Amino acid sequence: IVGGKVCPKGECPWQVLLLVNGAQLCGGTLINTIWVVSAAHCFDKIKNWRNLIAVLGEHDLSEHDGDEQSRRVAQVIIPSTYVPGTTNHDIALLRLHQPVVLTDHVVPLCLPERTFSERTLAFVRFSLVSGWGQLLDRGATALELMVLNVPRLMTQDCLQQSRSPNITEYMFCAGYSDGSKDSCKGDSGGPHATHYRGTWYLTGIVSWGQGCATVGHFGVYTRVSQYIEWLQKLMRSEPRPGVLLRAPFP
Amino acid sequence: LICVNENGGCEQYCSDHTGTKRSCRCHEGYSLLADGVSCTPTVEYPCGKIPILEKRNA
Numbered sequence A: 001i002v003g004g005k006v007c008p009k010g011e012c013p014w015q016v017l018l019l020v021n022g023a024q025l026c027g028g029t030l031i032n033t034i035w036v037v038s039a040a041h042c043f044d045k046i047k048n049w050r051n052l053i054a055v056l057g058e059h060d061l062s063e064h065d066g067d068e069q070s071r072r073v074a075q076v077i078i079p080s081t082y083v084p085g086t087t088n089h090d091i092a093l094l095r096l097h098q099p100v101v102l103t104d105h106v107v108p109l110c111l112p113e114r115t116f117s118e119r120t121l122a123f124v125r126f127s128l129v130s131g132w133g134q135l136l137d138r139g140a141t142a143l144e145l146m147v148l149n150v151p152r153l154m155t156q157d158c159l160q161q162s163r164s165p166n167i168t169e170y171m172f173c174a175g176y177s178d179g180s181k182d183s184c185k186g187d188s189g190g191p192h193a194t195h196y197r198g199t200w201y202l203t204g205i206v207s208w209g210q211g212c213a214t215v216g217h218f219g220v221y222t223r224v225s226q227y228i229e230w231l232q233k234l235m236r237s238e239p240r241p242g243v244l245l246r247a248p249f250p
Numbered sequence B: 001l002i003c004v005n006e007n008g009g010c011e012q013y014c015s016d017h018t019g020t021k022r023s024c025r026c027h028e029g030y031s032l033l034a035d036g037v038s039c040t041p042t043v044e045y046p047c048g049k050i051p052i053l054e055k056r057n058a
């Protein structure tokens, strides 16, 4: 995250850290006790699917304070329409091997109904994006969880204000074109969370951009509203042998 | 009332029904109050609420 602030410990309780062989891979969002939403592109280069770990309750990566909960990732589900190395359909649904225990420091973000998300949440101007990604373009990653308030743009306006992948109906733009504030490498997969009448909801996934905090460009986020029914169906399904599962979309 | 305007007055989710009818609903871990619009937690850790801040104003 570029140009944000430290998320006070426990104020981003749905944030997930994904690790491969102990190394930071990506972020994610807890949506109930066994399910995490992340970005498909995070898994393009995974060789051993059995070394993926999700950590909940994380805050300061330099220490252990006892609020952290680590789980093996039992399933990584990606839509059939996602093509590795590209930007469209950038979403993954992860099943944890064992549920996390909800606590003051581990709480799911609400996955909204599609209609609510499209008709109401899509018009809330500002939303929070968070992660332990790079603090600057070409810079070191964060040791404490960072958070940034970003305004959403209608895609027509994003394209007009921007100056290369298309912005599809499965994406939206948010942030700033002055190079000061953006999500960055390492934040991929993390939440774009939107507040409405006292409750927070998952509206986007940190996905891509032209570099990070690039002047003349905005951050691009997976439009989660397009995937609500796909996600809900998969969460009712029984697990299958083998971690990676490609599931038909729609 | 209609769900596309003002969320139909619902705190959370809204369904339009045949006639001038509307039903609000709440996410799991919440129940709908008698006003027909508000949602109140039914569990300790409902989704989308931040415990340390909910306690900070309790």
Ligand SMILES: NCc1ccccc1
Binding pocket: A182, A183, A184, A185, A186, A187, A188, A206, A207, A208, A209, A210, A211, A212, A213, A218, A219, A220
């Ligand atoms: N917000 C731009 C971005 C997202 C993910 C990775 C790199 C850049």
Ligand SMILES: [Ca+2]
Binding pocket: A058, A059, A060, A061, A062, A063, A064, A065, A068
């Ligand atoms: Ca820690």
Ligand SMILES: [Cl-]
Binding pocket: A236, A237, A238
């Ligand atoms: Cl099934």
Ligand SMILES: [Cl-]
Binding pocket: A049, A242, A243, A244
């Ligand atoms: Cl496997």
